[PDB]
Amino acid sequence: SWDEFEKLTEVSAFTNFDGSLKQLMDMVTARPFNELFFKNSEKTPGKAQLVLRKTPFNPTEWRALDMIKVPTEDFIEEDVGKSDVETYSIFTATPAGMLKELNGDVFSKPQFHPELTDRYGYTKFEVENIYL
Amino acid sequence: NFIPQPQGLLRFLNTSFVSKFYTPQLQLSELAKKVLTNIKTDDIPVLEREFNDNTIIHKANDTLLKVQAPRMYMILQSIVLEAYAIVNCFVENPSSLKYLTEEDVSITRENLNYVADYLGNYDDYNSVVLDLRDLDLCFSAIELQLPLIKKEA
Amino acid sequence: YHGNPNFYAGDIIVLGDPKYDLGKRLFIEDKQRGDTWEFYIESVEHKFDYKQGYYTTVGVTRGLKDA
Amino acid sequence: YHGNPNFYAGDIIVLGDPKYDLGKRLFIEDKQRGDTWEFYIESVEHKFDYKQGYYTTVGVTRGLKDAILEDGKGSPHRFAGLWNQSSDFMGGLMGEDTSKEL
Amino acid sequence: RFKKHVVQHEETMQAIAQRYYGDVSYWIDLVEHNNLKYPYLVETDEEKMKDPERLASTGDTLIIPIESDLTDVSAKEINSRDKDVLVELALGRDLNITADEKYFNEHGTSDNILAFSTNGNGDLDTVKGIDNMKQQLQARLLTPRGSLMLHPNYGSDLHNLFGLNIPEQATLIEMEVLRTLTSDNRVKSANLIDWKIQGNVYSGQFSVEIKS
Amino acid sequence: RFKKHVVQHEETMQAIAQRYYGDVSYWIDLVEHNNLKYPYLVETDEEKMKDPERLASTGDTLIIPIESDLTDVSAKEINSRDKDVLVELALGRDLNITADEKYFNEHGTSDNILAFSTNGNGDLDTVKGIDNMKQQLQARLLTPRGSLMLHPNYGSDLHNLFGLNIPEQATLIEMEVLRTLTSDNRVKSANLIDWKIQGNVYSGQFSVEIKS
Amino acid sequence: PQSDGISNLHRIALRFPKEGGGYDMYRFKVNPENYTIDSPQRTTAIKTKSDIVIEDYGKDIEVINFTGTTGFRPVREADGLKTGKQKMEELQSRVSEYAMQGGSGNVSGSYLQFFNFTDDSYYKVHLAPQGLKITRSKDEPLLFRYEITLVVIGSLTEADRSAVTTEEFGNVKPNASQRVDEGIKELDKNARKTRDRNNQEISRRENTIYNPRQSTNGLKGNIDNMALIIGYGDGGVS
Amino acid sequence: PQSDGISNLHRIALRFPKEGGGYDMYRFKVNPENYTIDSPQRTTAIKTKSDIVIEDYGKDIEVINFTGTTGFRPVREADGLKTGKQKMEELQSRVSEYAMQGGSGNVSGSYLQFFNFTDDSYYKVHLAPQGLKITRSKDEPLLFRYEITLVVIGSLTEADRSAVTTEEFGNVKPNASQRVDEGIKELDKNARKTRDRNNQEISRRENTIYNPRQSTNGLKGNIDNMALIIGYGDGGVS
Amino acid sequence: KTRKLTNILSKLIDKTMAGTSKITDFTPGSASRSLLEAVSLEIEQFYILTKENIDWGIQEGIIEAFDFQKRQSKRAYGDVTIQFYQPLDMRMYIPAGTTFTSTRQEYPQQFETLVDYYAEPDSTEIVVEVYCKETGVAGNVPEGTINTIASGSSLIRSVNNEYSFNTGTKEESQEDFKRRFHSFVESRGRATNKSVRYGALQIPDVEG
Amino acid sequence: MKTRKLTNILSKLIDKTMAGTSKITDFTPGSASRSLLEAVSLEIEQFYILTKENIDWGIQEGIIEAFDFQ
Amino acid sequence: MRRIRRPKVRIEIVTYNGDEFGAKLLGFQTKNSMEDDSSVFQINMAGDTYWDKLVMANDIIRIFITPNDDPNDKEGKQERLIQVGMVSQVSKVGSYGNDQTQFRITGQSFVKPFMKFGLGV
Amino acid sequence: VMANDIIRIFITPNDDPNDKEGKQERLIQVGMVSQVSKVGSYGNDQTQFRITGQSFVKPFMKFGLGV
């Protein structure tokens, strides 16, 4: 994961009242910054593996993923297209909820594009990271 | 990383008639020698409870073989050490399994038959022989399977 | 996440094979007009039955052309 | 509620009759292999139509096998060995006791 | 299981591996299975005199393990220990009871027929290899289906089929014989070769695809 | 790939671009492939005498790359200077082993036939172009299917197809030859043109549609 | 064999399973007028946008169907003199008995055995869903007609799939597991609790066909037998 | 060929795969009574308000179906003297061998070769879903009729898909990447960590048939080995 | 440490392309590709030979310098004499694989010949070596046990081995050899309590 | 078994090749035969180097195994 | 040319023999998706044997699929595992009006232990 | 068809020359497209393109008054 950007953590075991380990696993993952899923172990056939890696949307990490080819000869049916269901202009990664602007240091520092906000003005996307 | 041993087993382990078929030789394996030195020197953890009323508990100590036939009692200690030694490595710390060889178990079974036949004369103490016969076939499986295990691992 | 519009997403029913796995990058070449496509796999659903063939769904998201 | 696993539940489409009612105990004998079953009714859905027959659903829950018909005894295996045997709940079972090994 | 092979004129081990596995690179496992030094194949037979166990020449038998057991170290060790005698493990070894075939054939289905025997001296006779399989098949055929005290449905109903010599009885006997032989997993299948009915005694022969 | 073209009398580059690529606007990039100065096409021969390398006239050969490779800068750079060498590079280069063309025809399906030769001075002979393709096809046809030590399934079963010179055997041989010729992806397809069997000798011919 | 001139014709005969064991050899006195056999395949074809895909899964269940009529004049029988009507009634009774008794999902005994002597072939068959259809129209008033459809289970040459005798070398019923279970049952509750504690401790320290000869699968059985004859802790391990 | 002008026509033949290498064939002694070849097309037409739209997606499966019988009289064979019944039984056995152990076990041959000498056409075929169908009617006391449906894999002239050779000009194996991976395996933990950090640093400030001859595809592969062996940072970059 | 087929072949092709511009085709069946593949395969064979030799050296060579020799399983062998009824008149053929069996009921052992042998017309008594069909001590047999030959030739009168076979050495794992070597090494220690205690055990009467 | 540089092996191989004929003496860098011989000599040199390294590693492993001084 | 495919499914089970279990296979489904926080698969079984008394819950089942022919030496000859998980449900299924019955088994890919293990208070 | 385009639909109820009251070319709906996707089941040998949108609810719905 992003070791450099993440500081020391003190994540508690009982963060979720009588919750499953999956619920506590979600807090540690800090999605969408890290991807977690169960898949077959290609390197070691015959057993499963738990994957926890930084998101592949980075340029170099995108290149790291193995590539798979498939021609149109194997296509039975297709349903693919664009969609404006997800649309955000301002993005930020706030720290844990304990810190607050009024009684503490800086709380957030979002980012945006001047041309993007014209079509969708002040559309925010907030994510809380427990690591920070 | 060792399971604490029972007090009775720890006390037991830390120290004419002849059969025509099988005879002993009073030979100790290299692996058995190392375990004896470790227990003799290092203070291994031990348990405090004695719920398990089997094995040497009230059978190996209750019998009069300790005072009547001390030489026979030495054979039983050797089998226990060899039995404990092979169980030690497989359960935990398998690095010590390298020293074991086929001849180590072969002599142990011969010793078991000799003491087992002698105990057959006594009618009261057949309970000890009940476990030895079951243990006798256990060593034979290891004898016919130990060479394959080392090469596989 | 700023480029959510103009990307391509959906589901694809490719021929049933085990090569496809979750989280793997998918490359598609279109012979209809000599086009190229790229996709990221997020979901797969396999269906095996002797009644009719053997299929394998390949869910995709964040697609783009000219790969 | 400790015996939720190993019980049998689902829905059954029996022949349409009015004898079945909610909350009634259901006894089933299997002629396929000479087996016996027991069930507790929790839901029933009736369907009457001259187009096709007349059916009656019988929802069941908390089922078990090897039933007995005498005086509504039911399955003796229902009251298993873990039915009454238990103990009070306290810590020291996992993680708590590792630091107290003085 | 395995496949027998005979070395051709100056044949190459890599060619053998390619033929029997497709991929040439698996030859490294095959030589380890056979337990051979670097001179895997030598045209001159005199060179084998130096290290006969660890050197193969033209016409020497070789063992070709299946693809699944290629990389299994235990399979390698067992095949090395049992070079050229690996068939015995599958078919097995058992005590020999066919003391004299000239005598018990006439009696056929009846009691007090077979008995153990001793071959050589001291050591009790044991039948191994193809003879063991033939003995097991013959014993299974002769025994009734429901005679033994355990695991019933073992044997055949041949003794109930004696009667009219009409063709349908012959076909029933053929089907019963084929059913009895196919009951053993060690036999892949069986089929008739020729049938003959002359006089008042049925005659016939069968072939079985014995593995290995 | 690239389609060969010959400059026609009183023809312009715009018409040449429009005929093949459809849109005349592509001519701006097509000239860079040919590596020509502003006088792209000139009828006067003495005008080309000043700089024949960087000029073209009537009867000269042009290069027409496909649309996909038209925009590639690497294709432009390679086609600018190689000119006639593109066909040789497109079909590849390989060592020539037809030392005795008269001899190898006399021994079909026979080993130890082909060998290297020498052409020029002090260098092993090499083959290129359509000759290389024909040599490779002939070697593939002569090579048996399962003889090579690596990448198996290369060759044909021509040695096994000798028989009673009956029509069905002739059609089987035809199909085997067609499959052998069509194995290479470079060749499009093949088809028999004539059949002739008289006595105990099989004769025939085939046509292959080689790309470009 | 058919009526090829070398050997006389042999008529088709059935072999049903009797309720009290054995089989009854039912034989037709007239061969079926029509005989049809089907061999469907499980091949499936799916059209992709750029190529056709051909996929096969193997041989499908075969179907045997035939139709015929019984004889009119009386014909002698091996144990009586049965006319055509009696033969047809006996066939119907046998079919009804075989169908009714199969109320337990499937009869544990053998299936219907079909013997086709007209051409050399044998099959194991079962009653098709079409069943035994019997009719008698105005035409041919005194001749019955029967229509039978069947589904092939497998060749009669091969035995039942589940009844095949495996190799069963060594010992499939090892004594080590049995005596380990007996010892564990004989142990006290505290001993089993300590055994569970030791197993949990060993699990924490993980990180951070049976034959005594030439086999390693039974290694744990020998070790699991130990740790009870020798007090390796207050209870066994693994 | 045919019977007019040209010499006597050759009968239809079938080629099947022999298990122990080689091939075995089957020639019909009697030409089929019926022969139907279906060559449909996978195209759909849908009309809009004021226009017609036509779309096609290639050729459809060419289904071959024919029906024939076997002569009762004998005829010379390559080995032995087989009559019509024996020929039909052998055909059934071959079809069962191709079909019964197709989805189970293994069959060496991947397809069947269908020869039409009379029609002068050749195809590679597989058993259709309908499969073989054998029947004997009322008016055939001794004859046997066979009906078979087939699906064409493709033209027999073309080679197999698995036995196709590409152009493969230049080196196919990128040895540079192979030796880069081999060298990286020997690197220590700190070297790999520094390599990851350098890759992240380069990644976050970006925007602001191997053959060196006549190509540039294998550019960065060579740089990776040179950077690793020389050392651009503790671990390397890219 | 050791290379592979692809690792050698790809480097060979890369060097071939780099050195010269006259070769660009590397399709299957090419003469150049075939030569490179053969060279790579032979180099891989040499690599595996080196690896096996180094493994043997690790197992045995380093300790064998101290005069200690390891026991290697081998086929039992020895000289066998054959007697003819009369002197030979023509050269006789004895191809390899001639099976030998023992008529004694207590000895089911068998032997065979590895290489061909020939008896000249003038010769009357020939000595031929035989090798047991099984390894280990099973091939050992006392003198005069075979008494028969499987060829069934009428010229041969009797056959017997003049000396007992004793070369069928058993298989001993290197664990025992290493243990005995270590015990020998430890016994050479001087001025130590354990060494002094061991030195007192040489006398038979010194036990406790 | 001794280390030998690429040039000496290449020269020896070229000298051996020239025996029996004189239609080969042209070894410019553009010649393909020179490239093939260079590749072969490079592979042989790498084999010798790896053999020496593996011999040293085997000596170390034997020293480890004999006295058990891991 | 048109590709030929001969699927051959193999099933392995670890706590009845796995090979016998795999013989009675009829079909299966495997729903894996990153969008949701759970992966689930279903297996359809024949009614030849009474699986209700044999397949105890929480058992592990492995599935292997053969893509194409073995002797053809295709790249598909890899016996790649398609999915492995823990069963959590078995139930009889059958519509006797249609004269057919089936056994259905479903489970999740090792999400059951973490999901069920609740860190209580 | 780039996204967010405006499409107007007009429907002719009945015949033009008949002089019915339906001859009004009344607009049925107008809105902003927000999705376009390929659709097709090649097993049936048919494909279609589907476009959907909302009647001017997209701008207000997407325009979020942030903080």
Automatic annotation (TrEMBL), chain B:
<protein>
    <submittedName>
        <fullName>Uncharacterized protein</fullName>
    </submittedName>
</protein>
UniProtKB/TrEMBL annotation, chains E, F:
<dbReference type="InterPro" id="IPR020288">
    <property type="entry name" value="Sheath_initiator"/>
</dbReference>
<protein>
    <submittedName>
        <fullName>Baseplate wedge subunit</fullName>
    </submittedName>
</protein>
<dbReference type="InterPro" id="IPR036779">
    <property type="entry name" value="LysM_dom_sf"/>
</dbReference>
<dbReference type="InterPro" id="IPR018392">
    <property type="entry name" value="LysM"/>
</dbReference>
<dbReference type="Pfam" id="PF10934">
    <property type="entry name" value="Sheath_initiator"/>
</dbReference>
TrEMBL record, chains G, H:
<feature type="region of interest" description="Disordered">
    <location>
        <begin position="175"/>
        <end position="221"/>
    </location>
</feature>
<feature type="compositionally biased region" description="Basic and acidic residues">
    <location>
        <begin position="179"/>
        <end position="208"/>
    </location>
</feature>
<protein>
    <submittedName>
        <fullName>Putative baseplate component</fullName>
    </submittedName>
</protein>
<dbReference type="InterPro" id="IPR056958">
    <property type="entry name" value="Phage_tail_tube_init_put"/>
</dbReference>
<dbReference type="Pfam" id="PF23980">
    <property type="entry name" value="Phage_tail_tube_init"/>
</dbReference>
From TrEMBL, chain K:
<protein>
    <recommendedName>
        <fullName>Peptidase C51 domain-containing protein</fullName>
    </recommendedName>
</protein>
